[PDB]
Every structure is written in C-alpha cells, then in structure tokens.
C-alpha cells in the first residue's frame, strides 16, 4: 500500500513525474470539432497512463479504475486546458499551435458559453497564482473524487492529497488561516470544473 506511506514531498514529485506531455494538434463547425476531437483522443491515451501513476489508483479494481476515468475524463482535460491557458488571458491554449480566443468558440453552437466558463476558470487560477505543484494535486483529486474497504481507501488517498496541498501552502509561508482559506478556494473551483464537464458532456452527446 505504498500510497499512504509517501511523504508530502514524495507525493508532489510522484505527481510531477507522472505529468502527461503537451500534445500538438493536426492544424467551420466541422473543422474545429475535428481538431478538438482528434486532440482529446490522443490526450486520453496519455491520461490513462497518467492515471496509472497517481498513487493509490492501481490499488483499485479495474472496474473502479474504469468508472473513475469514465466520470472524470472531461474534467481532467478541462483543468489541463485551463492550466496551460493561465499565461494567455482571454485565450485557450488547446495546443501550442492551437491558441483560440472567445470568438473562435462561436463556430460551434453552444461552444462559446463553455469557452467563457473555461476562460473564467483560467482567470481565477491566474488571480490565485495557482502553482504547478497545486495543479497536479487538484487534478488527482478530480480523478479520485468525481466517481467515488475500497471507498475508504479512496478517501484515505484523498486525505493524503489534502495533506500535500496544506504542506505546499505551509512551505510557501502562508499562515494557518491562509492555508485553510486557500484550500477551500481551490476545492470550490472543482465545483465549477464539474459544472463545465456536465455542460460539455451534454453537448458532446449531441452528435
């Protein structure tokens, strides 16, 4: 059970080492959806291998691993997109060669509303100065939380990731009150990320 025995700093380096790469896109309502679909499909292959490296994930049955990735995959793609778009205000960096703005989200019906929500999430992360070590913790929380003996083990790993986030904030010099406030701010953004995935899944259903 080498997931509960990891130190806070070991959790960070393990999640940082497991980070997937930044893929390129092969670049109307059909052309852009084709690029986003092709991009997301290739990202999913890397996501599955990243998930297998999140501490505590492989301890689950293959059925639970499937269920967690089925429920969380779009959230994980979205927080990834939001993270790499932080240093591009008003733009979404789907790929280094595919940097789209809000207006280019009007080519697909209903896409611009979700574009606006993603841009607002990026602005929120930018205003909080979200750190990379915090980002990988949040993304692992999304994986383990969005579909949750076996349930207790998932909550044990989730508590360890909480300990890791608090460890990073204490390491940055935040006071005890600032750690709790910042922890809450980060986890409440996951509620909005869930909302964006729910909406995006509804429209992706419309195929």
């Amino acid at each position: 059970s080498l997931a509960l025995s990891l130190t806070a700093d070991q959790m960070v380096s393990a999640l940082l080492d497991a980070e997937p790469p930044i893929l390129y896109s092969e670049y109307s309502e059909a052309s852009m959806m084709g690029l986003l679909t092709n991009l997301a499909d290739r990202e999913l292959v890397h996501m599955i291998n990243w998930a297998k490296r999140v501490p505590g994930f492989v301890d689950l049955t293959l059925h639970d691993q499937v269920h967690l990735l089925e429920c969380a995959w779009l959230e994980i793609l979205m927080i990834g997109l939001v993270w790499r778009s932080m240093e591009h205000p008003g733009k979404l960096l789907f790929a280094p060669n595919l940097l789209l703005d809000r207006n280019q989200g009007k080519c697909v019906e209903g896409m611009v509303e979700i574009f606006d929500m993603l841009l607002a999430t990026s602005s929120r992360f930018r205003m909080m100065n979200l750190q990379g070590e915090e980002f990988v913790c949040l993304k692992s929380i999304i994986l383990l939380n969005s579909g949750v003996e076996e349930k207790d083990h998932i909550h044990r790993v989730l508590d360890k990731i909480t300990d890791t986030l608090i460890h990073l904030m204490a390491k940055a010099g935040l006071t005890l009150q600032q750690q709790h406030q910042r922890l809450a701010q980060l986890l409440l953004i996951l509620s909005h990320i869930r909302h964006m995935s729910n909406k995006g899944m509804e429209h992706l259903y419309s195929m």
């Binding site: 292959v45 599955i48 297998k52 293959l62 691993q65 499937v66 990735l69 089925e70």
Partner: peptide
C-alpha cells in the same frame, strides 16, 4: 470497452 483494454 477500449478504456478497459487500455488499462
């Protein structure tokens, strides 16, 4: 599923 095969 394919997700099952990839895992």
């Amino acid at each position: 599923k394919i997700l099952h095969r990839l895992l």
